[PDB]
């Protein structure tokens, strides 16, 4: 089965990509027990930036093209106890991403979930917490609500929403 | 010259929406996030949530998640919290506020002077 | 969560005293943690950030320190306007204050 990211605009082929990793925030206050709960990052540019993985390409989200780890997924961050710091999360690896400029772009349904049970592992380790939910973005300018990636000097804006609704346990 | 100029009190029946006004001047708005932060009558603070201006990406705090909207107009140095479907329970002094430092975030040299809001019936 | 517990509850204190306040952290995070005082019908004022670092206008008397878990906030000789509540915070959870009174 494929997971789809309806794009506008439509990113022609040759803007297919590797998924490096990815970049979020986690929701704070009491968690209502025993779950964290998990979005796209709510910072900007200054957080990918520091990320240091982040590669040739400028996106938000997702890291595209970028730098992959050893043999596993390594999250990272300034302070995991600050929801105000952002986790960066590098691949070992990579998902690819085909565009096809029909108008939507696509990733492996089976690839993603054996790739977001990793990353559901190794955040269950540092918090401690039994289940963790992904979930979309909490708002913000379009440039960050949503995927969107510098192809060629064009600027494109893809939905991410399949990539984050899932809960693992 | 930091001061944070918030809108009037309000009084609202259950089940109405509040939107509470946070002017900021003396400081480049888009360098810091600002938080909202309620106290009831009588009891302590508690953090409803922050917003990035710059990005406006939000982090709501979990007990406030699908009621609370926060956004910013950059244009006039303008942040705004809203809280849809009001019950009695949220009757509370809400304000903005902002941390002494970028990094850590959290000390908060800089509030409002506090917008009170009273659920009704 | 990260529970914070104040110590006391009340304290009762006269003018020219040495208040001492506490606060312990239910982990280990001990470089970050804030005090504010409150007065009724008014704002939250910082008076200490990073554990132990005197926020603005805030006068030498007050002072603070991190014992790890511990964290304790000192008010050397006690003005009479320095009788309020006061909450400690540590990134978005705060503490059930500590009121601090005239003893008579």
């Known amino acids: 089965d494929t997971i789809t990211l309806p794009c506008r605009p439509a990113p022609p082929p040759h803007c297919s990509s590797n998924i490096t990793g990815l970049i979020l925030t986690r929701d704070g206050g009491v968690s209502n027990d025993e779950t964290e709960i998990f979005r796209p990052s709510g910072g900007d540019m200054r957080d990918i930036a520091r990320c240091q993985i982040a590669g040739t390409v400028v996106s938000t989200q997702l890291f595209l093209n970028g730098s992959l780890a050893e043999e596993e997924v390594v999250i990272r961050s300034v302070d995991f106890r600050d929801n105000a710091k952002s986790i960066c999360v590098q691949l070992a690896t990579s998902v690819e991403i085909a565009c096809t400029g029909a108008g939507h772009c696509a990733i492996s349904r089976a690839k993603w979930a054996n790739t977001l049970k990793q990353i559901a592992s190794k955040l269950r380790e540092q918090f401690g917490a039994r289940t963790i939910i992904f979930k979309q973005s909490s708002g913000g300018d379009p440039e960050f609500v949503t995927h969107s990636f510098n192809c060629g000097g064009e600027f494109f804006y893809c939905d991410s929403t399949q990539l984050f609704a899932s809960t693992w346990f | 010259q930091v001061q944070l100029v918030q809108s009037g009190a309000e009084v609202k029946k259950p089940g109405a929406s509040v939107k509470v006004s946070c002017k900021a001047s003396?400081?480049?708005?888009?360098?810091?996030?600002m938080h909202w932060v309620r106290q009831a009558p009588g009891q302590g603070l508690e953090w409803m949530g922050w917003?990035?201006?710059?990005?406006?990406?939000?982090n709501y705090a979990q007990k406030f998640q699908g009621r609370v909207t926060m956004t910013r107009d950059t244009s006039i140095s303008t942040a705004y919290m809203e809280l849809s479907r009001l019950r009695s329970d949220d009757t509370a002094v809400y304000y903005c506020?902002?941390?002494?430092?970028?990094?850590?975030?959290?000390?908060?040299?800089?509030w409002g002077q506090g917008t009170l809001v009273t659920v009704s019936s | 969560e990260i529970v914070l517990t104040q110590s006391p509850a009340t304290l009762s204190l006269s003018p020219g005293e040495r208040a001492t306040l506490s606060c312990r952290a239910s982990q280990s995070v001990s470089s970050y943690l804030a005090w504010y005082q409150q007065k009724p019908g008014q704002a939250p004022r910082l008076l200490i950030y990073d554990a132990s670092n005197r926020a603005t206008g805030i006068p030498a008397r007050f002072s603070g320190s991190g014992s790890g878990t511990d964290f304790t906030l000192t008010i050397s000789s006690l003005e009479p306007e320095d009788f309020a509540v006061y909450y400690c915070q540590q990134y978005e959870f705060f503490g059930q204050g500590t009121k601090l009174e005239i003893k008579r």
């Open positions: 003396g400081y480049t708005f888009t360098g810091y996030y």
């Open positions: 506020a902002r941390g002494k430092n970028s990094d850590y975030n959290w000390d908060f040299q800089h």
């Open positions: 917003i990035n201006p710059n990005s406006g990406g939000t």
